Design a protein around this ligand. Structure first.
Ligand code: CLA
Ligand code: CLA
Ligand code: CLA
Ligand code: CLA
Ligand code: CLA
Ligand code: CLA
Ligand code: CLA
Ligand code: CLA
Ligand SMILES: CCCCCCCCCCCCCCCC(=O)OC[C@H](COP(=O)(O)OC[C@@H](O)CO)OC(=O)CCCCCCCCCCCCCCC
Ligand SMILES: CC1=C(C/C=C(\C)CCC[C@H](C)CCC[C@H](C)CCCC(C)C)C(=O)c2ccccc2C1=O
Ligand code: SF4
Ligand code: SF4
Ligand code: SF4
Lengths: 80, 171, 739, 130, 34, 160, 41
């Protein structure tokens, strides 16, 4: 399964979570930004690696980073 | 009327009930074939399949081989027969290795029920799972299937060679 | 306040000319990177994203059609002007069989005057392969003054079409209901446009082209031929050549149409003097076509209680296997310009290819069959246009599926049912493509390896394992027996290609029976295989344009997008555009093979010279039958052999063909930089170049960005097509002009 | 006509699940609709909702989530996606805590959070032979 | 057995038998389990 | 002489080339009639060929064994009109172009909308700058001295 | 003629005019003094 990391540059704009096609990211409470929220990656087993999450990231060099790793039938997007 | 409907009333299968997949002709024709004919041991299925396959396999090798003859030649017939037999040997090798790497069962249609009843808390894929309930889906069943395919292929190739010689000589 | 048009919808102003990208909501803000410049031209004619109203899109399309027709009229006016002023048409008229048509002279600069060839008739210029001289002769044009007046009329018509486009966008723009009168539009295009054009052309042929060309074939010089208007004012100048005009129009109105058999014939074959179709046959053909199309125009109900409704016709064509049938197709084709473009472009390209075939098969112009460069150029050009138009039709079908397809409006109709089993279609088409390619090409490779191994009796040749195209030979036999048996009123077969005598004009073969052997079997199956693979790519693009097992929401990404990401193992080129890109490549392959087959087969087994005793000697000598069955044969006896004229053209009047040969090779190889590479590399190289510019304080404000992935693919395919087609263009033209 | 009365009125497509969603895992999405709206299947073509309980089975979580995202356009929000293993092993997936992942809910802990930006990542040479 | 019979003895042997046994072994090895 | 070459005025193969070209042109001229424009054009071609060959002969041009003028670009002023003088001319023209482009970029770079003035050129300012490039060698060695030609550390750099 | 002159000031029109003028004076230099292999001086 791929690896997804969140960095404290998160501004809690939720654009990553609402762009994930496989429900990998979610918004959790935080105290490091104005919005009081930070993205989390608790379901990386469903991560497919499409990187839509970091295409919607407005922070300078990203706050969500997807590191491709071992492959799985879920991560390979295999309907068969 | 509509002649295409979801297969077995399941609209989510990747299949359809067309006048070809589920027609009475298709049903009977596939049920008379050796692979699906009822009352056949795996050895018998293999033997019939091998006979038919060697019988029609000697044809192209003898007719279009490297040693053809517009007249009848014993050398051409021998070349075609040997090529067909070696191709059957290659196919039997493929069958043997496929069965070796595919199944780990010696008696099917039971192990599935045993693990659906007496629990299967093991390494799985041998107790649980098990795709298919046919006797062809076992280590023993596939071994006898390959043996029958190989023997029947030899016999059918020889029979077809004899028939070809008779047709070319007496006609 | 008319019910069909809106008056003064858009003000005629130059203000928006000074605001580039005003049409697009995204481009209107102004450029920030160089991507804006490329996006400006890529969205110029995408009127769907510029307005949200079908009416505005329709009006823009209508005015764009007017602009295109004005451009076409300007091009035709230029052609006629060049024929009038910079051509040897008058000299070619007096010696069609010994003077090469030329209509473009080259200025004497930088030594380029060598391009002015010895075309004959005391003229120097570039030999013309568009066949305008033969067309003008068939029109009865015997003077360059008539060409000048046709050019002036073309200029006037081009201005008229420009004014019409301006008028119908800015002064009186038609409403949506006017555009959606498909019944009225079909009635008019079938009766008025097609039928009345055929009728008017039949009238022109009968009254101008029939007498003038008959006098020309009789040997009368163009100077003593009467002016065309005199054939109308004087019923005695035409009644001598065709002694049936003496009865006037009375036989027509008295149903005694047999009297007009003098100039309305049904002969078939070719004119023995000119080698083209009998112009009496052509006039009769156009008359029959006019009547048929006028009749066909009275079919659809427009404004009276009479005719058909296309909605009622389509909705009644259901079936057990097709569910709702054609229900909803009328709404699809009356609310989506892209669907209409798909159908029209596909059928238009197919029509162009059919035209290309029927052109050389039955030469319709005087002294055009013996002008081999003209025949080769016309066939190749029309087949190329047909292939491009077919790929465009597939592209716009995919665009309709992505954009204008409504799932709710197409419940259980034909479109829905096709998408529901797209897998089966694509898988079986894949199997057919593999079968056809394996067979055709592997038979070619088997022939090649048997020849390389010294086993000549193991080939798929005529003197070996033979694959006779018996079905095509049966059809050829049926056509050569048609006159008197199935076409009892015919005097000769439609084309001598099906069989018959060798038709020669001035010792040059015009047409001759095209024998079909095992060599034609293999190349025909190659054609079928290439066509099937192109259809596979385009149909996979159209059917999987909305969704797939990979990307279930591919329609939300649009018609034109590079990918969905490196995930799923990699989702490159999943668009539908990336399928029109690959299909363009495969169309190039297929059309190149088709034109190669045509060129070699014609040069080897049709074209040539006929000895006075009747011995036929061809351009190459019949090497197609035995040497076109191996890839080495195609490489050596066709490519290497017939490329001799291109490579040895330096210093001669054909040197421009060698230069274009080299330049097209250069462009084709240039394409591979865009086709093989990716953006990350070019963007990161532009980074260092921008660093240098910033170091020298010369970095542009418009930030330079590497071409987008889709634009990189588009540039690659455009350069590939240009280079390959130009290489074949120069090769064909130099070879067929030299010999 | 159909196995269950709550299935959407779909005519079946050769784009549904395969042998994989019989021995590895299958996904089911359930929702309640006020109207028998016509919607597009993530696999094939157009299906008709039921004016009530609707249940659909798919081979991938992404297919169920694409269907759910389409449902939001119909003002349908109560859709829930489950994962079914080879036997009836049902696990609720998408509304994991009853609140959509885009809305912050108490009781969620950050997973995969690094207390630094990208520039704070360790050098790969120090993450070797070790 | 002359030295000129060695090509006809070895070339079929190597170029056909060795592929067969090598394919058998490699397929068996890469299709193993744990 | 230089590199084993010989002057083209004494190169027999050069005169053979001239004679062959003239003979081909005259043979082409034979197939036309009277004072017709084709004959006039071919005669002009012959005259231009003769003039070009004569000028190349009397041009301090060295010809090889193929009878074609070879360029001596080692730097000697004897053959200075072959490379050195055209080199100076191009350097002047290209420096002019680069200088006017850089001056326009730096001038409209201090306005409200620098990017707008790059697709829509300020033709008055463009004409003002372009005709001022004749002093580009002097302007360059008056801006380099003042440090206005080179940036120092406001230029951007990648991560490593 | 205020926006037309601004349209003529756009990059494509100006580049086309400048390149047409440039090719023009190059071609005319090569017409009046053709076959110039070296510097005239
Ligand atoms: C649309 C099709 C078309 C095309 C491809 C051409 C192409 C050509 N024309 Mg032409 N022409 C056309 C339409 C066309 N014309 C029409 C409609 C007319 C009638 C007004 C003319 C009238 C015309 C004349 C009178 C002449 C040409 C000439 C030429 C040639 C040189 C053009 C040139 O250097 O201009 C350069 C143009 C510019 C720099 C303007 C920017 C060139 C092959 C010339 C030629 O062949 O010389 C021997 C020539 O004398 N044309
Ligand atoms: C001098 C006459 C004139 C003037 C001032 C205008 C002015 C206008 N037109 Mg208009 N138009 C005219 C003639 C004119 N038109 C004619 C004759 C036609 C019929 C073809 C049209 C068809 C037309 C359409 C369909 C549309 C406009 C639009 C517009 C507006 C924006 C135009 C723009 O920015 O694009 C300026 C574009 C150009 C200068 C490009 C010219 C393209 C030519 C034809 C290509 C020819 C090149 C040739 C083929 C060689 C290729 C190589 C503007 C009010 C648009 C509008 O109002 O919608 C927002 C719009 O959609 N016009
Ligand atoms: C008998 C009547 C008639 C005729 C001859 C035509 C002819 C044509 N129509 Mg047309 N049309 C008609 C009725 C007619 N239409 C009606 C009733 C409708 C309403 C449903 C339309 C709606 C329509 C649309 C929406 C479009 C056309 C287009 C075209 C052109 C197709 C391009 C082509 O084949 O090039 C052949 C070209 C020629 C033969 C050149 C000569 C043609 C000239 C211009 C005569 C045109 C006849 C015109 C209708 C007379 C009106 C004059 C005006 C003062 C009232 C062609 C010129 C397409 C086009 O290109 O747009 C411009 C297009 O997009 N038509
Ligand atoms: C649009 C096509 C077209 C046009 C404009 C004309 C025009 C003409 N034809 Mg005509 N014609 C045509 C098609 C056409 N024809 C076709 C297709 C045929 C083949 C049947 C003929 C056969 C034909 C004959 C046999 C004769 C004409 C004649 C004439 C002229 C007198 C017309 C007359 O008296 O009719 C009256 C008009 C109406 C009743 C309306 C006139 C110039 C006559 C003539 O003067 O020939 C020089 C004549 O004798 N035509
Ligand atoms: C009747 C013909 C016709 C019409 C009306 C259209 C119309 C359209 N097409 Mg289309 N198309 C056609 C034929 C046609 N096409 C054909 C034959 C093909 C197959 C190649 C395609 C392939 C195609 C694709 C793949 C796409 C379109 C798109 C579009 C839309 C936007 C076009 C645009 O802005 O381009 C503006 C014009 C240009 C960018 C011009 C580019 C210059 C070309 C590529 C090079 C031409 C070189 C030329 C031959 C000279 C070379 C000589 C050399 C020596 C210099 C528009 C609705 C696009 C879209 O989004 O649709 C919604 C899109 O993605 N079309
Ligand atoms: C004939 C084919 C062809 C040609 C002409 C080029 C030309 C070029 N490539 Mg290239 N390339 C090609 C095929 C080709 N490539 C292929 C097939 C690949 C494999 C994918 C690559 C991969 C590649 C890479 C990875 C790089 C290049 C680079 C370059 C540039 C090198 C500098 C140079 O020569 O400037 C002179 C340019 C030319 C001679 C060609 C254009 C000039 C035309 C004729 C001007 C016409 C104006 C009208 C140049 C633009 C490098 C680059 O960008 O350097 C800056 C670079 O990094 N190319
Ligand atoms: C080193 C590699 C190698 C070698 C030595 C051979 C050898 C041979 N090939 Mg071959 N081939 C190879 C690679 C090789 N191939 C590859 C890579 C390809 C694909 C590109 C091909 C494709 C190919 C084709 C398409 C054909 C051959 C054929 C042949 C035979 C030559 C024709 C002849 O006179 O025999 C005549 C042959 C016989 C009289 C009978 C030979 C039958 C087998 C080979 C005998 C093996 C005996 C074996 C020990 C039996 C085991 C016991 C069994 C009874 C249980 C010969 C046996 C031809 C042939 O004979 O087809 C069968 C033929 O048509 N080859
Ligand atoms: C834009 C650049 C440019 C420049 C600087 C010149 C410069 C000149 N041209 Mg000229 N010319 C140009 C472009 C240019 N031309 C173009 C584009 C054409 C159309 C193809 C012509 C057509 C032309 C003709 C027909 C004549 C000139 C002539 C002349 C000369 C006297 C005026 C002068 C040297 C005249 C001359 O010197 O001939 C004796 C002359 O008769 N020119
Ligand atoms: C060719 C076969 C053919 O066109 O028969 C025609 C057959 C009859 O369908 P229908 O009777 O339902 O068509 C009635 C209306 O849809 C008219 O189009 O169409 C099919 O079943 C499509 C299957 C294609 C299978 C490809 C083989
Ligand atoms: C070179 C290259 C670039 C860089 C190319 C750029 C930036 C294009 C630059 C075009 C210049 C600026 C304008 C065109 C200049 C030509 C001389 C004009 C064309 C010639 C005319 C005769 C038409 C990409 O962006 C790219 C993207 C994706 C895949 C491959 C590639 C790729 O290979
Ligand atoms: S890849 Fe990016 S987008 Fe796709 S799931 Fe993993 S995180 Fe969400
Ligand atoms: S993407 Fe970066 S910014 Fe947008 S939400 Fe996820 S973390 Fe916060
Ligand atoms: S960039 Fe090229 S490779 Fe990476 S995803 Fe987009 S297309 Fe596939």
């Amino acid at each position: 399964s791929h690896t997804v990391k969140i960095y404290d540059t998160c501004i809690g704009c939720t654009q990553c979570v609402r762009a994930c096609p496989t429900d990998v990211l979610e918004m959790v409470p935080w105290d490091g930004c104005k919005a009081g929220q930070i993205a989390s990656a608790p379901r990386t087993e469903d991560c497919v690696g499409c990187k839509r999450c970091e295409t919607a990231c407005p922070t300078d060099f990203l706050s969500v980073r997807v590191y491709l790793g071992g492959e799985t039938t879920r991560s390979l997007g295999l309907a068969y | 009327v509509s002649f295409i409907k979801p297969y077995r009333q399941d609209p989510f299968v990747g299949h359809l009930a067309t006048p070809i997949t589920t027609s009475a002709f298709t049903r009977a024709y596939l049920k008379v074939l050796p692979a699906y004919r009822p009352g056949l041991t795996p050895l018998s299925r293999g033997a019939e399949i091998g006979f038919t396959h060697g019988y029609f396999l000697i044809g192209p090798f003898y007719t279009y081989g490297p040693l053809r003859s517009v007249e009848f030649s014993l050398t051409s017939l021998a070349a075609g027969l040997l090529a067909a037999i070696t191709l059957l040997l290659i196919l039997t090798v493929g069958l043997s290795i496929y069965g070796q790497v595919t199944y780990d069962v010696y008696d099917n249609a039971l192990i599935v029920k045993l693990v659906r009843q007496m629990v299967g808390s093991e390494r799985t894929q041998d107790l649980p799972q098990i795709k298919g309930t046919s006797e062809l889906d076992t280590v023993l069943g596939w071994q006898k299937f390959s043996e029958g395919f190989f023997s029947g292929g030899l016999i059918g190739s020889i029979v077809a060679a004899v028939g070809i010689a008779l047709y070319s000589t007496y006609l | 306040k008319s019910t069909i048009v809106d008056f003064n919808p858009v003000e005629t102003s130059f203000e928006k000319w000074a605001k580039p990208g005003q049409f697009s909501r995204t481009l209107a803000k102004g450029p920030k990177t160089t991507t804006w410049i490329w996006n400006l031209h890529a969205d110029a004619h995408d009127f769907d994203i510029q307005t949200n109203s079908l009416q505005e899109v329709s009006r823009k399309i209508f005015s764009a059609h007017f602009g295109q027709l004005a451009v076409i009229f300007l091009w035709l006016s230029g052609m006629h002007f060049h024929g009038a002023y910079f051509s040897n048409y008058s000299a070619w008229l007096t010696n069609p069989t010994s003077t090469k048509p030329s209509a473009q002279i080259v200025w004497p600069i930088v030594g380029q005057e060598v391009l002015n060839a010895d075309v004959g008739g005391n003229f120097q210029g570039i030999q013309i392969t568009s066949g305008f001289f033969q067309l003008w002769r068939a029109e009865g044009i015997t003077s360059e003054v008539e060409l000048y007046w046709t050019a002036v009329g073309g200029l006037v018509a081009s201005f008229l079409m420009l004014f019409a486009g301006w008028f119908h966008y800015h002064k009186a723009a038609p409403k949506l209901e006017w555009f959606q009168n498909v019944e009225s539009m079909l009635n008019h295009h079938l009766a008025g446009l097609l039928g009345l054009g055929s009728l008017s052309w039949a009238g022109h042929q009968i009254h101008i082209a029939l007498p003038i060309n008959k006098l020309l074939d009789l040997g009368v010089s163009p100077e003593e031929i009467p002016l065309p208007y005199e054939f109308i004012l004087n019923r005695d100048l035409i009644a001598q050549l065709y002694p049936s005009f003496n009865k006037g129009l009375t036989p027509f109105f008295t149903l005694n149409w047999g009297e007009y058999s003098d100039f309305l014939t049904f002969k078939g074959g070719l004119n023995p003097v000119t080698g083209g179709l009998w112009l009496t046959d052509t006039a009769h053909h156009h008359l029959a076509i006019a009547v048929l199309f006028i009749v066909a125009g009275h079919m659809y109900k427009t404004n009276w209680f009479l005719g058909h409704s296309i909605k009622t016709i389509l909705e009644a064509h259901k079936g057990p296997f097709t569910g709702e049938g054609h229900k909803g197709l009328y709404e699809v084709l009356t609310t989506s310009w892209h669907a209409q473009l798909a159908i029209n472009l596909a059928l238009f390209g197919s029509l162009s290819i059919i035209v290309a075939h029927h052109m050389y098969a039955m030469p319709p112009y005087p002294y055009i069959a013996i002008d081999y460069p003209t025949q080769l150029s016309l066939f190749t050009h029309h087949v190329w246009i047909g292939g491009f138009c077919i790929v465009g039709g597939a592209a716009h079908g995919a665009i309709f599926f992505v954009r204008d397809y409504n799932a709710a409006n197409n419940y259980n109709n034909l479109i829905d049912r096709v998408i529901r089993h797209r897998d089966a279609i694509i898988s079986h088409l894949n199997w057919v493509c593999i079968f056809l390619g394996c067979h055709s090409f592997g038979l070619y490779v088997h022939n090649d390896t048997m020849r390389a191994l010294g086993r000549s009796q193991d080939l798929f040749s005529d003197n070996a394992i033979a694959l006779k195209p018996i079905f095509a030979q049966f059809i050829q036999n049926l056509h050569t027996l048609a006159p008197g048996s199935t076409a009892p009123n015919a005097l000769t077969t439609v084309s001598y290609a099906f069989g018959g005598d060798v038709i020669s004009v001035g010792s040059k073969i015009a047409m001759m029976p095209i024998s079909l052997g095992t060599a034609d079997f293999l190349v025909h199956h190659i054609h079928a295989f290439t066509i099937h693979v192109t259809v596979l790519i385009l149909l996979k693009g159209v059917l999987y344009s909305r969704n797939s097992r990979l990307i279930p929401d591919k329609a939300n990404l649009g018609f034109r997008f590079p990918c969905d990401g490196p995930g799923r193992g990699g989702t490159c080129q999943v668009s539908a555009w990336d399928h029109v890109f690959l299909g363009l490549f495969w169309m190039y392959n297929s059309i190149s093979i088709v034109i190669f087959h045509f060129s070699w087969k014609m040069q080897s087994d049709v074209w040539g010279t006929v000895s006075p005793t009747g011995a036929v000697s061809h351009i190459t000598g019949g090497n197609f039958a035995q040497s076109s069955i191996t890839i080495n044969g195609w490489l050596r006896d066709f490519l290497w052999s017939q490329a001799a004229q291109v490579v040895q053209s330096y210093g001669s009047s054909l040197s421009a063909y060698g230069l274009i040969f080299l330049g097209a090779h250069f462009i084709w190889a240039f394409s591979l930089m865009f086709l093989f590479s990716g953006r990350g590399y070019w963007q990161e190289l532009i980074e260092s170049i921008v660093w240098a510019h910033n170091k020298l304080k010369v970095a542009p404000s418009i930030q330079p960005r590497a071409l987008s992935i889709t634009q990189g693919r588009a540039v690659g395919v455009a350069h590939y097509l240009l280079g390959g087609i130009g290489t074949t263009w120069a090769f064909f033209l130099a070879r067929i002009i030299s010999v | 006509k159909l196995k269950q009365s709550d299935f959407p009125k779909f005519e079946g497509s050769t784009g549904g699940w395969l042998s994989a969603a019989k021995n590895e895992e299958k996904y089911v999405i359930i929702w309640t609709s006020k109207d028998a709206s016509l919607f597009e299947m993530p696999t094939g073509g157009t299906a008709k909702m039921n004016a009530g309980n609707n249940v659909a089975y798919f081979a991938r979580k992404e297919q169920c989530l694409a269907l759910g995202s389409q449902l939001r356009g119909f003002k349908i929000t109560n859709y829930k996606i489950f994962r079914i293993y080879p036997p009836l092993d049902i696990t609720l997936l998408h509304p994991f805590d009853g609140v959509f992942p885009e809305k912050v809910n108490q009781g969620r802990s950050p997973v995969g959070k690094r207390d630094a930006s990208i520039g704070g990542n360790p050098n790969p040479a120090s993450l070797k032979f070790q | 057995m002359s030295l000129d019979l060695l090509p006809s003895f070895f070339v079929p042997l190597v170029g056909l038998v060795l592929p067969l046994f090598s394919i058998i072994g490699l397929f068996l090895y890469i299709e193993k389990e744990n | 002489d230089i590199g084993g070459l010989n002057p083209c005025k004494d190169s027999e193969v050069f005169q053979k080339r001239l004679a062959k070209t003239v003979k081909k042109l005259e043979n082409r001229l034979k197939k036309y009639e009277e004072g017709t424009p084709p004959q006039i054009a071919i005669q002009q071609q012959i005259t231009q060929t003769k003039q070009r060959f004569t000028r190349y002969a009397d041009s301090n041009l060295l010809c090889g064994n193929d009878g074609l003028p070879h360029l001596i670009t080692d730097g000697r002023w004897s053959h200075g009109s072959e490379f050195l003088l055209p080199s100076i001319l191009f350097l002047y023209i290209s420096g002019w172009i680069g200088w006017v482009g850089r001056k326009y970029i730096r001038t409209v770079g201090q306005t409200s909308n620098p990017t707008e003035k790059e697709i829509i050129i300020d033709v008055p300012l463009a004409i003002s700058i372009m005709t001022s490039g004749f002093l580009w060698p002097f302007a360059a060695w008056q801006e380099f001295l003042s440090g206005d030609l080179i940036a120092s550390d406001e230029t951007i750099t990648t991560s490593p | 003629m205020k926006d037309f002159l601004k349209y003529l000031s756009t990059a494509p029109v100006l580049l086309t005019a400048w390149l047409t003028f440039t090719a023009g004076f190059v071609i005319e230099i090569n017409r009046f003094y053709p076959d110039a292999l070296t510097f005239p001086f």
